[PDB]
Design a binder for this molecule. Sequence first.
Ligand code: SF4
Ligand code: SF4
Lengths: 96, 176, 113, 82, 208, 114
Amino acid sequence: ASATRLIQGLRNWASGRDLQAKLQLRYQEISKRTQPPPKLPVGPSHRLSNNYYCARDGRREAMPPSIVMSSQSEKKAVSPAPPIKRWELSQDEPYL
Amino acid sequence: TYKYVNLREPSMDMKSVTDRAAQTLLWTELIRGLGMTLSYLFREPATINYPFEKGPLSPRFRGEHALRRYPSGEERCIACKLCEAVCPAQAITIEAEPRADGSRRTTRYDIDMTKCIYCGFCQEACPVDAIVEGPNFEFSTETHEELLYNKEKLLNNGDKWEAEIAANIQADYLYR
Amino acid sequence: LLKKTTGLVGLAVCETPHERLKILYTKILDVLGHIPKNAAYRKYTEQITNEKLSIVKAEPDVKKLEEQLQGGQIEEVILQAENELSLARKMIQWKPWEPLVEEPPASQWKWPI
Amino acid sequence: PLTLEGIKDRVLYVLKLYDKIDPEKLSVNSHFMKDLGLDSLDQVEIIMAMEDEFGFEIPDIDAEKLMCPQEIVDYIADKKDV
Amino acid sequence: TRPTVRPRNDVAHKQLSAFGEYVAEILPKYVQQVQVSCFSELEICIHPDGVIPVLTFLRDHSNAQFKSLADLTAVDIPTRQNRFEIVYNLLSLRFNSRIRVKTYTDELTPVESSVSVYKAANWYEREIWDMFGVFFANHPDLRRILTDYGFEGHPFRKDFPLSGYVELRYDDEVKRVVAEPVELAQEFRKFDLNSPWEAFPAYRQPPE
Amino acid sequence: TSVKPIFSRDMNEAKRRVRELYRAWYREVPNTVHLFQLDISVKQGRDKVREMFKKNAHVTDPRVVDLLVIKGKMELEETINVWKQRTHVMRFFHETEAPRPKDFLSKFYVGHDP
Ligand code: SF4
Ligand code: SF4
C-alpha cells in the first residue's frame, strides 16, 4: 500500500492489471483478532418432549443387506439406473 | 454445466494470421511474461522478519502439550486415562495411584512428542481441561530424548504457559 | 452435417453411422443366434439389440438418433455395439448360461463372522 | 568331441575339481546318490560344471538321468558325433 | 426420523435389485449371491472361475458398461477356509452406477488375473500379491509393489503382527543398513474396547 | 481334496521347477558378488543358496512349492536387475545379529525363551 504513485503506475502498467484494487497483502480490512463471544445454536434433538431416542435412532435403522439372489415371462431388460442425462454446455462461459 | 477449455479454432484472415506471426517473430507473450515478473519486482514482498516478527496464529493452535491446574494450585488431571485411550499415536502413557491424601492422581504421565501427531484429541477428550495443547511451537531440541516428556516437564509447561493457555481457552471454550 | 469432433480423444468421427450401426446390430443378432433360446443372455441381448436396430432404422437424422438411442455420441454407440459383439463371441465360448459350477462353503458370504 | 577317452578323462577331471567327491571312490561307474553320498543339488551343480566344460546346455529331463560319470560321457557322446 | 437419520434411497434400491436379478440370471454359472445393502450398493458374489466372464460381461454389456475399475481389494477373514475375499469395485459412466463383485480364494488357489478386462488391475492385484499373498495366474509382471525388497510375509494378513518381525537400523561396523529382529522400547498397548452388550439387534446371529 | 494347481500337476514337475530355479541362482551368484561388490566369496553365497533351498526341503504339496519357486524367481528378478541394494542381499547373512543360545542351559542363563 505504501508504494508511491510512480511505482504504483509502473507496476499497473507492467502487469496490465490494476493491482491496488486487489492487493495480496492484507491490511485493516481483515477481521479483528479479538472477537465477541459466540452463542452457538443447538441441534434439533435439544427438546424436552417428543424426543425419544428410539424415534430418531439412526444406527438401529440400518438393516442387513437384502439377499436378492442366493444359491442357498418376457421380462424387460434392465440397466443399473436410467442412463445419465447428457450434460448441457455452460450458459455462463462455454468457451464458444 | 460444462465448458470446453482449448476448443478455439483461430481466425485465418490476414489480420489474425499477421497477429500470430507478429507474436511469433516479435515475442509478444514473452514480453508479457517479463512484464508480469517486473510487476512483482516493484511490489512490497510478503516476507515477515522472523524471529522479530511472528506468523499469525489463532487461539485454537495445537503446539506443545501442558498439564494444567485449578486456580488453587491443584492439578486438574484425575488419572482417568481418556487421553491415552483416544491418543491415535499412543503417545500418552499414564500410571496412577491414590496419593497421600487419598486423591485420584497420576504418578506417570508421559507424552512421547515424537509419536505425537498434534491432533488435539487429548484436549478434547479431557473432561477437566487438564491436558491441553498450548501455543508453543518453538521447542526444537538437540537430542531425541528431550522430546520424551514426563509429568514434570508437562507440569512445568503448564506453569510456564498458563497465563496464555487460560486466555486461549477463554477465547475458544464456547466453540467446544 | 459432418460432426467435426466427437470430443472424446481417440474416438474418430464416423462418416456413415447408420449403416455401421445396422451392420453391427445384425451381426450381433447373427452371432447371438448361436446361443440357446433358454439362455437369458440371448433373450436380453436380442431384446435390446432389436430395440436399438428399430431406433436406428426409424430415424434418418443423427442428432435425434443420439437423443433417443440415449447412449451419448453416435460413435460411442458404435463402439458399444462393437463391444457387445465381442462380448457375445466370448459368451459363446464361456457358456455362462450353464448351472452353477460349485456351491460356496457354508459360511462363505456370512458377514459379520 | 574329438576322442571319447579324452571326453571321459575331462569328465573325470571336472569331477575331481569338485571337492565333495572323494577322488579315491571316484570311478567311471560310481553312482552320485547312493554310492558317493550326494544331495540332488550336488548333482545339479555337477551337471552345471559339465555344461561349463563342454559348452552346451543340458536340459532338465536328461540331466536327471545322469547318475554316474559313464552316463555323463554317454550323453555327451550322444549329443555329438564321436 | 428426519434430521439426523440418513434418508433411504428406495428408487436406487429397487433399480439395483432388479439389475442384480438381471446379472444373476444372465450368468448363473458363476453367480452365488446377489445382495443389495440398506444404503443402496449392489454386491455380486461369484465363484472364482468366473472372474473373466463376469467382469467382461459387466465391462462390455450394453446394459452394464462398467468401463471403469474403481478399486480392487482383498480382505483377509481367517475364520473362513477361503480366507481371502477379492473385491472388485466397478463404475458405470453410462448408467451412473457402481457394482461390487466379490469372490474368494485361500492361500494356494490362484485367482485368474483381470488385466485382460481392466488394465487398471495391473498394479492392484500386484498389491494384493504383495499384501496378502494371493497369486494371480497369467499376470504380466507379478511381484512386490509396496514392501521392501527382501521382505518376508504378507503384511495385511491378520495373523501378521502390527510391527513386523524385523526392523532396520544403520550399523557402523558393516557400513550398511541391517535387518535385526524387532524389539519395541514401548510395546503397542492393545485395548480391548469391545462392549459386552449387543449394539445392533438387527444383525444378531442366530444361536447354534 | 480336488484343488486347482498353480503350475505343477504333481511333485515331479514341481521338483523340475525347483531344479531350474536352483540352476538360475547358481549361475547368478558370481554376478551378484561382483556387481553388488559383496565382501563374501562365491562359494559362501552358493552355500547360502543351498541353505535357503534345504530350508524348504520338507514340503510335499505341489502348490506350496510352486509358490516357493515363484517367490524365488521374484527374489532372483530383484537381484539380477539391480532393484535390491547391497543391504538387501546381505540380509541373508545375519552378520550384526548376535549368535543365539542353542542348548537348554545357555537359554536358561539369558532368559525365559524356550
Ligand atoms: S495431540 Fe493427539 S497424538 Fe498428541 S498426545 Fe494428544 S491425542 Fe496423542
Ligand atoms: S483425559 Fe485429562 S484427566 Fe483424564 S487422564 Fe488424561 S489428562 Fe488426566
